[PDB]
């Protein structure tokens, strides 16, 4: 269509733009701990270290209704899942690598769609 790769302004465009990212983040090998919502016990203290609980189980649920149509909105949620994940799980299990891996692909994806916030 056009020759642009950094302007997720329109909601209709950013709509599927995030759908593709979330769609991949869900199919990504590193995306189990986010698929299922982590209770407030199975995790090494969660209600305490986590002030803004967030999981892929609720993200796609909101995306389907076009809830993320801005920039830091979707970028914040995704980061919330990875950043908060490591926060509760000490850098020792394999979950740490999963977030870092899916977090790397995510950053690259928004770079291709034009998301990114900083
Ligand atoms: N399988 C339930 C969601 C992931 N489980 C979980 C729960 C709490 C803490 C960490 C993990 N985890 O690394 O899979």
Domain ranges of the chain: 1-118
- Nearest-angstrom CA–CA distance, 98 and 22: 15
Query: What approach was used to elucidate this structure?
Result: NMR
For residues 33, 37, 40, 41, the Cα torsion angle rounded to the nearest 10 degrees is -50
**Contacts of 54 by beta carbon, 8 Å cutoff, 6+ apart:** 77, 80, 81, 84
Residue ranges of alpha helices (H) inside 1-118 are 11-27, 32-35, 56-63, 72-88, 95-113
95 touches ligand 1 (CB under 6 Å) = yes
Atom of ligand 1 nearest to the CA of 37: 3
43 touches ligand 1 (CB under 6 Å) = yes
| Minimum CA distance residue for ligand 1 atom 12 | 33
Q: What angle do CA 76, 77, 83 make, to 5 degrees?
A: 80
Q: Nearest 5°: phi and psi at 20?
A: -65, -45
CA of 44 to the centre of ligand 1 (A): 9
CATH number for the domain formed by residue range(s) 1-118: 1.20.920.10
């Amino acid at each position: 269509g056009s020759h642009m790769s950094k302007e997720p302004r329109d909601p209709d465009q950013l709509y599927s733009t995030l759908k593709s990212i979330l769609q991949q983040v869900k199919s990504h090998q590193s995306a189990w701990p986010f698929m299922e919502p982590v209770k407030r016990t199975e995790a090494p203290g969660y209600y305490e270290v986590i002030r803004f609980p967030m999981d892929l189980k609720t993200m796609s649920e909101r995306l389907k209704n076009r809830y993320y149509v801005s920039k830091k909105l979707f970028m914040a949620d995704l980061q919330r899942v990875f950043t908060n994940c490591k926060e509760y799980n000490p850098p020792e299990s394999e979950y740490y690598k999963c977030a870092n891996i899916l977090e790397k692909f995510f950053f690259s994806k928004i770079k291709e769609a034009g998301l990114i916030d900083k």
